[PDB]
Amino acid sequence: AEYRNWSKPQCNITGFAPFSKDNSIRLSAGGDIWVTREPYVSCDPDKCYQFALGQGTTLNNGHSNDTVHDRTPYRTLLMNELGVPFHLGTKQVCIAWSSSSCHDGKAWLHVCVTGDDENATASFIYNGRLVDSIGSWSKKILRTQESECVCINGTCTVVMTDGSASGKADTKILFIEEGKIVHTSPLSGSAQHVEECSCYPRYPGVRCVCRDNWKGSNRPIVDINVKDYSIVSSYVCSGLVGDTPRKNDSSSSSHCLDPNNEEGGHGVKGWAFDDGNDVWMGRTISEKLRSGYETFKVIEGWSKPNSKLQINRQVIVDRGNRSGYSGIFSVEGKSCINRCFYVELIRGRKQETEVLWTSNSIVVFCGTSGTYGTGSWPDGADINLMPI
Amino acid sequence: AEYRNWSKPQCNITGFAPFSKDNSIRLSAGGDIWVTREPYVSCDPDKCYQFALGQGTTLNNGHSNDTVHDRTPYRTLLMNELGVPFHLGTKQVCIAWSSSSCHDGKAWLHVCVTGDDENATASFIYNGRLVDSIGSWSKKILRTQESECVCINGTCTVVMTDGSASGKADTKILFIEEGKIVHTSPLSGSAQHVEECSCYPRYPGVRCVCRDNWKGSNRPIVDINVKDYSIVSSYVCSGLVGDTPRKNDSSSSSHCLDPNNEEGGHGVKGWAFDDGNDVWMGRTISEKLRSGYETFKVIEGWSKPNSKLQINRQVIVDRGNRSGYSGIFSVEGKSCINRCFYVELIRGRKQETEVLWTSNSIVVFCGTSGTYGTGSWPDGADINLMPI
Amino acid sequence: AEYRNWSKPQCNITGFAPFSKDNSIRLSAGGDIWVTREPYVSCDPDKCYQFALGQGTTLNNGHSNDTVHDRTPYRTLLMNELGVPFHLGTKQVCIAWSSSSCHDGKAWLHVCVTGDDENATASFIYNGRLVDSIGSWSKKILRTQESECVCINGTCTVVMTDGSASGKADTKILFIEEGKIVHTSPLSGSAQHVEECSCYPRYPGVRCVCRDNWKGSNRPIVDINVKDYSIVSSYVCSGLVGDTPRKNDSSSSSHCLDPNNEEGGHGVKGWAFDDGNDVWMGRTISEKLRSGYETFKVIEGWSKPNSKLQINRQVIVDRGNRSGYSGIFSVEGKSCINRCFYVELIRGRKQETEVLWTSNSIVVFCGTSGTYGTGSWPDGADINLMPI
Amino acid sequence: AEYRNWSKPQCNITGFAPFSKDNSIRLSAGGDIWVTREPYVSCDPDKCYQFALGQGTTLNNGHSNDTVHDRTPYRTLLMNELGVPFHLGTKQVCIAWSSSSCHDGKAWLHVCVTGDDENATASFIYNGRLVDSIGSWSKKILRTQESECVCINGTCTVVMTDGSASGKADTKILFIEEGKIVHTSPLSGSAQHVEECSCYPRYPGVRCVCRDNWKGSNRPIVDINVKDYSIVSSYVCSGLVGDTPRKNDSSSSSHCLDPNNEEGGHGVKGWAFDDGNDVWMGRTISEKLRSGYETFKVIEGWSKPNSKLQINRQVIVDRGNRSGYSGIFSVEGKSCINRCFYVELIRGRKQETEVLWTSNSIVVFCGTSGTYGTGSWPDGADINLMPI
Ligand SMILES: *[C@@H]1O[C@H](CO)[C@@H](O[C@@H]2O[C@H](CO)[C@@H](O[C@@H]3O[C@H](CO[C@H]4O[C@H](CO)[C@@H](O)[C@H](O[C@H]5O[C@H](CO)[C@@H](O)[C@H](O)[C@@H]5O)[C@@H]4O)[C@@H](O)[C@H](O[C@H]4O[C@H](CO)[C@@H](O)[C@H](O)[C@@H]4O[C@H]4O[C@H](CO)[C@@H](O)[C@H](O)[C@@H]4O)[C@@H]3O)[C@H](O)[C@H]2NC(C)=O)[C@H](O)[C@H]1NC(C)=O
Ligand SMILES: *[C@@H]1O[C@H](CO)[C@@H](O[C@@H]2O[C@H](CO)[C@@H](O[C@@H]3O[C@H](CO[C@H]4O[C@H](CO)[C@@H](O)[C@H](O[C@H]5O[C@H](CO)[C@@H](O)[C@H](O)[C@@H]5O)[C@@H]4O)[C@@H](O)[C@H](O[C@H]4O[C@H](CO)[C@@H](O)[C@H](O)[C@@H]4O[C@H]4O[C@H](CO)[C@@H](O)[C@H](O)[C@@H]4O)[C@@H]3O)[C@H](O)[C@H]2NC(C)=O)[C@H](O)[C@H]1NC(C)=O
Ligand SMILES: *[C@@H]1O[C@H](CO)[C@@H](O[C@@H]2O[C@H](CO)[C@@H](O[C@@H]3O[C@H](CO[C@H]4O[C@H](CO)[C@@H](O)[C@H](O[C@H]5O[C@H](CO)[C@@H](O)[C@H](O)[C@@H]5O)[C@@H]4O)[C@@H](O)[C@H](O[C@H]4O[C@H](CO)[C@@H](O)[C@H](O)[C@@H]4O[C@H]4O[C@H](CO)[C@@H](O)[C@H](O)[C@@H]4O)[C@@H]3O)[C@H](O)[C@H]2NC(C)=O)[C@H](O)[C@H]1NC(C)=O
Ligand SMILES: *[C@@H]1O[C@H](CO)[C@@H](O[C@@H]2O[C@H](CO)[C@@H](O[C@@H]3O[C@H](CO[C@H]4O[C@H](CO)[C@@H](O)[C@H](O[C@H]5O[C@H](CO)[C@@H](O)[C@H](O)[C@@H]5O)[C@@H]4O)[C@@H](O)[C@H](O[C@H]4O[C@H](CO)[C@@H](O)[C@H](O)[C@@H]4O[C@H]4O[C@H](CO)[C@@H](O)[C@H](O)[C@@H]4O)[C@@H]3O)[C@H](O)[C@H]2NC(C)=O)[C@H](O)[C@H]1NC(C)=O
Ligand SMILES: *[C@@H]1O[C@H](CO)[C@@H](O[C@@H]2O[C@H](CO)[C@@H](O)[C@H](O)[C@@H]2O)[C@H](O)[C@H]1NC(C)=O
Ligand SMILES: *[C@@H]1O[C@H](CO)[C@@H](O[C@@H]2O[C@H](CO)[C@@H](O)[C@H](O)[C@@H]2O)[C@H](O)[C@H]1NC(C)=O
Ligand SMILES: *[C@@H]1O[C@H](CO)[C@@H](O[C@@H]2O[C@H](CO)[C@@H](O)[C@H](O)[C@@H]2O)[C@H](O)[C@H]1NC(C)=O
Ligand SMILES: *[C@@H]1O[C@H](CO)[C@@H](O[C@@H]2O[C@H](CO)[C@@H](O)[C@H](O)[C@@H]2O)[C@H](O)[C@H]1NC(C)=O
Ligand SMILES: [Ca+2]
Ligand SMILES: [Ca+2]
Ligand SMILES: [Ca+2]
Ligand SMILES: [Ca+2]
């Protein structure tokens, strides 16, 4: 095995094609299936895996009551091959209420954060063993991407935040070689608040599109140089903005440099990626709620401030159905690197009160250079058929 | 690993011997087992796998109600080693309400169709990654074989249809190398309607026996040249015809060129293969319903129009028990290529109303050059012991 | 990989030590576990597997009612690593109501008999594919060992019977190379009725100890030459006889040549093996019922007619608990070939009427050259805690 | 593969970071999960496995009643990858009510003790086969570590005891090469009673920290030379003592040579390891009960009699929650050998009478040279939501 360098060009993208769906909530009504949230996908050089943060319980289980909360000592990172729902044979890779994972071409890295909110521990596990750890630097919920990290030539990078979710916080970018932290760089640039970054290789470095939970409904961008550890940051130029909540399409804006101060408080994890001067992006269809999911290309939406010229829209989840977090992962083909994304389909409390639990399923799409049609691929469980 | 060429001769066939059975409906009454339909079998160079289209639910689950329908956004292609019933650890390989899979000697190809009836997407997944996609060309339920595709020297071929199920439709043959579509040829020849082809390697090309849903109770044949992409087609010569519904044995006929216009509307997926001038074929024992299953050789039934001289009959499922789709797969031996087949054993609605679900189990037989006896290997579940 | 030749000497044996137990009936009261009977063990060069004939159902399942019967079209051969109980992820290797399996050093052979009692089919599956088949030669329940076959230099041998279970029958020894039957020899010698042979490599050939269901409570021996296909047979010399039913120890006898005509009708599968002039053997502790299980060495019990001088007794299952079939398997060590055995622990009907099903668990011991103590390792389920 | 020698230095330790948690009791309320006790962890050169002694039953099962007892013929050693809870697909490696396992770099050794209390058998299984056995030498519950053994250059060592749990007993150290016992040495030195040793490689030999069940609340140390088979022993010097029960911190003492005679009767399995003149150790937070779990370093606590100067305390399980046995395992990194530990989190009877069963989950931490925060990671099941 050799280290990945991701040195091939990005594949041509005309949109996205269906790749995977796990139906886990429908299965949970007739099977012992983990309660999860914050899923993601990452692939080793041969095959893809799904990940999520368990809640230390199956769904048809009294312990699924009041699983809406994000952080408990029972959450662990689950990992199975993609399309295998999280069943009782699934491996719990580490103790985690926040995580990121990625394969460097030779082995898996996992970054797993657990413990007290004011004094958490992040463990760094590589090739099946603990190699490093850090404690919280700001004593305010050390936390990370909830999607794949990215490794180039054996140096893996991951973005972490510690501090307020509604004010200035302290974000840092770690550089990790065979599980050992070799450098830590502070965030720099124009991004004012960065959470839950969705990162991808853009040789020779790494590019991330994140969540501003404070003043922006436009998404931050963080670029990472893995050779000299420098960082720059700004916001996606597109005037069709990617966060939820957000204003309507006519009222929304971005001009690349600053948070837009438009319904900027709160947010949802999401993604975007550049294609020349254009941007491909996903977002919820609702502007207020995590309902529906659409993708499209904004023409000149990477380079031109406030462009709203979209094309190539696809509905992934219709507006009548629940969505959730979403994130990017990248897959090496014969001659190019493709971009794919997952959508978390959240079910249960607080929004659906017929049940006491909160969980999710996933759906997953990959870039295509071919053609495609239309559809909608929601979670599909009937809340009234579920165990309470 | 090397590409398969399937260049060995067909094995000698004196009939068929038992190979596998999964008992999945009996197990579903005391276990969490997927609801399926449209199963098939395909082998990599070492071992065989069973496949089927899940319904996004287990059987003992409220979501198994009204699983008679063919297309939903929750159907996914399931894949396990042959003889492992579809349990909660089974991988959902792709999103699909129509599919075909095959191994080229180096990796698996999956062709997976999902989305809206009038604007579906087919994804082409090879070696664990999405490589290509197409949209519907006729806006009328793009669909494929529901059994294994066939690859020679790294070029895999698969037959797809789009258009009416009871009128002229548009069938195309795709040629796919490492997941990338390199050519598409239209159907040509005397076959007038082609669905759900059962294809096999017949070096140097591929031969298929299919379902005419419009005017024939005789089965179409499609031959595919993988070098120059040419296509020819006609109908199985045997006057003992392979579709259901069909007329009785004295009234039925075929003369090789045209659909017989004998109870030709509707049909069932099935198979046949040539053995010199003779044909080996399966069919339901009932002429009207998907009940029982028999195989036999028709002497000169490949070459002589309307031959009805059978020999070497075997009952696979007695006339009192349900059958379903059936299809061929091929397995390389030391010196010859063998032909095998599966039978889908459908249980539940609409025919059996004691339950609300529709599902299936499988039984599987392989060609033999040896000897054998008699038996009957039906699904075996007692409908009155099942969850509703 | 190379073919096994089993050319090392037999290990020194001072008795037997515990090796495995699956607890499957206790687990069946809180888990979805197959209903089985006729288990056995066989090892590839690295690790051991347990096998059994399923009944097409789990235990907590309405289909477990009236699973006392030996032959149905739903029975399949199950195979898992040894110590993994038969759960819903277990592979059903073939359709079988009688079977034998063995690994030749390169791949697995399975011999699987199914179909009608008067016209069964045996399939021969090697390296994952069907290679050969035969039909019944006497039209009276073609059947085989229910324990491992044995392969030397790529030639595997298996003993099969067809004909009366209470009169002269037709036994044959098949010689199978990479799944293909290359020769069939009739039984020859002084054994008058041979069923369910427990065979082991005794380089340069194979030795079997079997069940006489007609006139002997002493067990037949069949010796097989794999080079020239010749066969000889007789009966274990020990006057402590191995079958059940049998007379008491003072009344029982054997003089090596003939069935003893002592409670000879009926029987149970079992085993013995030679150690110089001595014999190591197992048997039920009860003389009438399949209750308890003991092993011991009879001094000069291989060579001296009617020797009853035992030593080195061990209780494996106390007399108060149920046993069942038992059989031998052999395991290659660094410098010697060891002998091991399993015991089927049968629970349920007809003897235990609190439940409607019949099933079993297993316990497994291996020869030792070391020391050991005493114990009893019965099934352990409480019949009153079981699903009906 | 090569034999492990463990010749690298011990890693620098600043404390411990979270590594794994299985949540098995919470899962048992909605899933078929084994009833266990006496767990441990051991790693092959690539990945870690969890082990425990099953009780021959799942938890939601009538057979889980009265599983408080330590020894039955149904207990077997379970083994899965670390973080996979013990589910129905888990392999039962051997019959055992006491065990130890370890990987020599090429294959696994298991030491498995079962049978009658007064005449037990220990089986020695290596690379999947039984290689050796011994019987009890003192006829009083032959027993072993309940945590990993240690192998250097192909010689594995394991500590065993036979005799009184409250008086002088006979402890022996066995040296085992590819499963064969090559030497047995008696305990020698100042340790007066030794049970349940937690051993680790300390090149060129092995060091163990154990449980004195008779007169010490300070833990014994046993050092083993694997070249010449010599043994020495004494007690951990730290005046902060590691057993439970124990006196309070001001009253407790140790002076390295003798059991302290301070609440010395009874005990719990636990661990400690040297770091220069300092000692890292775990213990329950309660002095009387198996409640809470803490680690810390005692400065000069390896070399200076009765040192009580602690630093670097961490709570692993808060004082309000149950703990249990604990033990060490060692993991090879790129340049150093790390020390890790597990804690058994016992639930059920006798202490918790709402249920009839006794079982456990695990939590696992590894040494770090980095930084970390605070937390508490208890079992987390609600006893009132459990099956009885
Ligand atoms: C079968 O499946 C296929 C594949 O999924 C579907 O095709 C997709 O259809 C969607 C929806 O129409 C297309 O996305 C939309 O693209 C619009 C921009 O393209 C049009 O305008 C440009 C500029 O004039 C033209 O160049 C284009 O022409 C070319 O493409 C068409 C096919 O679309 C060919 O027919 C032509 O020959 C040309 O080659 C197009 O005419 C874009 O405006 C649109 O976004 C608006 O609409 C969506 C709802 O659809 C809103 O959510 C969104 O907010 C936008 O609305 C704002 O903007 C409009 C316009 O200014 C205002 O009117 C609104 O008020 C609001 O301000 C969306 O992105 C997609 O490109 C196309 N894919 C491909 C590969 O062709 C088939 O439709 C489907 N068939 C069925 C029956 O299911
Ligand atoms: C144990 O298992 C074995 C293996 O499964 C069974 O053997 C199989 O038996 C079936 C059923 O008999 C055989 O298939 C049938 O083959 C018929 C053609 O062969 C006969 O005719 C030709 C031409 O005269 C002869 O050459 C043959 O002779 C040779 O073979 C036999 C053994 O069969 C030997 O004994 C001889 O020495 C020769 O070597 C045969 O005599 C074929 O007609 C038949 O199909 C009709 O019948 C089936 C029902 O069985 C109908 O479904 C079907 O529609 C056909 O009926 C139409 O045609 C007939 C005849 O014209 C009309 O009368 C009807 O009205 C209707 O128009 C079927 O294909 C099979 O070949 C054979 N397998 C082998 C390898 O031998 C054993 O029977 C079984 N024993 C038991 C007790 O279970
Ligand atoms: C801890 O575990 C160990 C290991 O499992 C147990 O040791 C085993 O114990 C059994 C039962 O005693 C032994 O098997 C029996 O062997 C009897 C033959 O050996 C004795 O006689 C010969 C000939 O005189 C002597 O050479 C032997 O002496 C040597 O061995 C002993 C140890 O046993 C040493 O102490 C000596 O120093 C010598 O080295 C023995 O004295 C054999 O007769 C016996 O079979 C009869 O009894 C069983 C019930 O146990 C019946 O089921 C069976 O039918 C036989 O009974 C018939 O025969 C007798 C005698 O003629 C008649 O009296 C009866 O009426 C009837 O006709 C059995 O095979 C086994 O060898 C031994 N294993 C080893 C390795 O030592 C320990 O006992 C156990 N301790 C506890 C407390 O649990
Ligand atoms: C976020 O997480 C981190 C990491 O887990 C937490 O930091 C850990 O905190 C614990 C608890 O304080 C530390 O362990 C304790 O260490 C005590 C010894 O160190 C102090 O004394 C020595 C000698 O004077 C000084 O050198 C030290 O100074 C250095 O370290 C501190 C940080 O701790 C820096 O701030 C300094 O600049 C220096 O670099 C320390 O001052 C040790 O006494 C203590 O053990 C007593 O207390 C525990 C309860 O905490 C009792 O269970 C135990 O029995 C001991 O109590 C006996 O002894 C004391 C003192 O004699 C008596 O008063 C008692 O009555 C009784 O006799 C414990 O081992 C740990 O070292 C530290 N880890 C690291 C890496 O820093 C943060 O606190 C946490 N923050 C939050 C808010 O959650
Ligand atoms: C769902 O989980 C809730 C949060 O844990 C449980 O509420 C707790 O209940 C106890 C008892 O009233 C309180 O002491 C504690 O303050 C907390 O609110 C709740 O009981 C549990 N069950 C249901 C059905 O809601
Ligand atoms: C089985 O599934 C049916 C098809 O989904 C359910 O019918 C639906 O029921 C709702 C309520 O009456 C309708 O609004 C909808 O039109 C559709 O017919 C059916 O309820 C469900 N259950 C049963 C027991 O049949
Ligand atoms: C257990 O299985 C029996 C054997 O299949 C069932 O008996 C059958 O029952 C039907 C109905 O009376 C008969 O027509 C048939 O002859 C056969 O005896 C039996 O019902 C089933 N259940 C129980 C509880 O015994
Ligand atoms: C839990 O398991 C106990 C120990 O096995 C059972 O007690 C046994 O019960 C039988 C019947 O009274 C006695 O003969 C035997 O002496 C022993 O005490 C107990 O019944 C079982 N169930 C419960 C609910 O405790
Ligand atoms: Ca925001
Ligand atoms: Ca038709
Ligand atoms: Ca007999
Ligand atoms: Ca003590």
PDB file of C-alpha atoms in Angstrom, chain D residues 145-224:
ATOM      1  CA  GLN D 145      -5.473 -14.675  34.926  1.00  0.00           C
ATOM      2  CA  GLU D 146      -8.752 -13.513  33.334  1.00  0.00           C
ATOM      3  CA  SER D 147      -6.575 -11.184  31.200  1.00  0.00           C
ATOM      4  CA  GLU D 148      -3.962 -11.430  28.497  1.00  0.00           C
ATOM      5  CA  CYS D 149      -0.922 -13.676  28.698  1.00  0.00           C
ATOM      6  CA  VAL D 150       2.410 -12.408  27.234  1.00  0.00           C
ATOM      7  CA  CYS D 151       4.729 -13.990  24.643  1.00  0.00           C
ATOM      8  CA  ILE D 152       8.383 -13.136  23.898  1.00  0.00           C
ATOM      9  CA  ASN D 153      10.217 -14.818  21.012  1.00  0.00           C
ATOM     10  CA  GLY D 154       7.528 -17.522  20.784  1.00  0.00           C
ATOM     11  CA  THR D 155       7.522 -18.390  24.515  1.00  0.00           C
ATOM     12  CA  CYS D 156       4.205 -17.425  26.120  1.00  0.00           C
ATOM     13  CA  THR D 157       3.820 -17.291  29.878  1.00  0.00           C
ATOM     14  CA  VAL D 158       0.711 -17.563  32.007  1.00  0.00           C
ATOM     15  CA  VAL D 159       0.183 -17.579  35.763  1.00  0.00           C
ATOM     16  CA  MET D 160      -2.173 -20.191  37.302  1.00  0.00           C
ATOM     17  CA  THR D 161      -3.295 -20.951  40.874  1.00  0.00           C
ATOM     18  CA  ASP D 162      -4.819 -24.014  42.505  1.00  0.00           C
ATOM     19  CA  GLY D 163      -5.739 -24.224  46.195  1.00  0.00           C
ATOM     20  CA  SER D 164      -7.474 -22.102  48.857  1.00  0.00           C
ATOM     21  CA  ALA D 165      -8.773 -18.550  48.115  1.00  0.00           C
ATOM     22  CA  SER D 166      -8.227 -17.652  51.821  1.00  0.00           C
ATOM     23  CA  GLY D 167      -5.037 -19.519  52.764  1.00  0.00           C
ATOM     24  CA  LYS D 168      -1.702 -20.754  51.253  1.00  0.00           C
ATOM     25  CA  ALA D 169      -2.334 -22.018  47.660  1.00  0.00           C
ATOM     26  CA  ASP D 170      -0.113 -23.405  44.918  1.00  0.00           C
ATOM     27  CA  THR D 171       0.657 -20.895  42.145  1.00  0.00           C
ATOM     28  CA  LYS D 172       2.676 -21.914  39.072  1.00  0.00           C
ATOM     29  CA  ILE D 173       3.979 -20.087  35.999  1.00  0.00           C
ATOM     30  CA  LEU D 174       3.737 -22.059  32.733  1.00  0.00           C
ATOM     31  CA  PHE D 175       5.889 -21.466  29.663  1.00  0.00           C
ATOM     32  CA  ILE D 176       4.169 -22.459  26.428  1.00  0.00           C
ATOM     33  CA  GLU D 177       5.637 -22.628  22.892  1.00  0.00           C
ATOM     34  CA  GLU D 178       3.149 -23.034  20.030  1.00  0.00           C
ATOM     35  CA  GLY D 179       0.612 -24.372  22.552  1.00  0.00           C
ATOM     36  CA  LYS D 180       2.972 -26.958  24.135  1.00  0.00           C
ATOM     37  CA  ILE D 181       3.911 -26.571  27.793  1.00  0.00           C
ATOM     38  CA  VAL D 182       7.744 -26.639  27.841  1.00  0.00           C
ATOM     39  CA  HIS D 183       8.337 -25.756  31.527  1.00  0.00           C
ATOM     40  CA  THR D 184       6.411 -25.096  34.742  1.00  0.00           C
ATOM     41  CA  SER D 185       7.951 -23.030  37.564  1.00  0.00           C
ATOM     42  CA  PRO D 186       6.460 -22.681  41.108  1.00  0.00           C
ATOM     43  CA  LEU D 187       5.842 -19.181  42.455  1.00  0.00           C
ATOM     44  CA  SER D 188       8.816 -17.997  44.518  1.00  0.00           C
ATOM     45  CA  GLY D 189       9.490 -14.790  46.460  1.00  0.00           C
ATOM     46  CA  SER D 190       7.623 -12.691  49.009  1.00  0.00           C
ATOM     47  CA  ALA D 191       4.152 -12.718  47.483  1.00  0.00           C
ATOM     48  CA  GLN D 192       2.044 -14.858  49.830  1.00  0.00           C
ATOM     49  CA  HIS D 193      -1.142 -15.296  47.769  1.00  0.00           C
ATOM     50  CA  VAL D 194      -1.484 -14.659  44.044  1.00  0.00           C
ATOM     51  CA  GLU D 195      -4.683 -14.660  41.930  1.00  0.00           C
ATOM     52  CA  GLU D 196      -5.835 -13.150  38.628  1.00  0.00           C
ATOM     53  CA  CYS D 197      -2.547 -11.656  37.540  1.00  0.00           C
ATOM     54  CA  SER D 198      -2.447  -8.665  35.141  1.00  0.00           C
ATOM     55  CA  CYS D 199       0.746  -9.192  33.204  1.00  0.00           C
ATOM     56  CA  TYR D 200       2.704  -7.164  30.683  1.00  0.00           C
ATOM     57  CA  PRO D 201       5.935  -7.470  28.650  1.00  0.00           C
ATOM     58  CA  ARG D 202       8.886  -5.721  30.258  1.00  0.00           C
ATOM     59  CA  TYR D 203      11.664  -6.860  27.957  1.00  0.00           C
ATOM     60  CA  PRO D 204      13.479  -9.168  28.405  1.00  0.00           C
ATOM     61  CA  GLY D 205      10.830 -10.678  30.706  1.00  0.00           C
ATOM     62  CA  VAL D 206       7.247 -10.370  31.933  1.00  0.00           C
ATOM     63  CA  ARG D 207       5.929  -8.439  34.948  1.00  0.00           C
ATOM     64  CA  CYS D 208       2.580  -9.100  36.648  1.00  0.00           C
ATOM     65  CA  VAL D 209       0.513  -7.250  39.254  1.00  0.00           C
ATOM     66  CA  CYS D 210      -2.049  -9.462  40.934  1.00  0.00           C
ATOM     67  CA  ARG D 211      -4.735  -9.957  43.624  1.00  0.00           C
ATOM     68  CA  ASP D 212      -3.931 -11.229  47.151  1.00  0.00           C
ATOM     69  CA  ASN D 213      -7.175 -12.652  48.431  1.00  0.00           C
ATOM     70  CA  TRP D 214      -5.881 -13.600  51.868  1.00  0.00           C
ATOM     71  CA  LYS D 215      -3.902 -11.053  53.868  1.00  0.00           C
ATOM     72  CA  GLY D 216      -3.083  -8.149  51.534  1.00  0.00           C
ATOM     73  CA  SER D 217      -4.971  -5.061  50.297  1.00  0.00           C
ATOM     74  CA  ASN D 218      -1.615  -4.172  48.609  1.00  0.00           C
ATOM     75  CA  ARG D 219      -1.155  -5.957  45.290  1.00  0.00           C
ATOM     76  CA  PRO D 220       1.490  -8.652  44.672  1.00  0.00           C
ATOM     77  CA  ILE D 221       4.068  -8.329  41.904  1.00  0.00           C
ATOM     78  CA  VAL D 222       5.414 -11.415  40.073  1.00  0.00           C
ATOM     79  CA  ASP D 223       8.374 -11.114  37.706  1.00  0.00           C
ATOM     80  CA  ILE D 224       9.054 -13.873  35.180  1.00  0.00           C
TER      81      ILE D 224
END
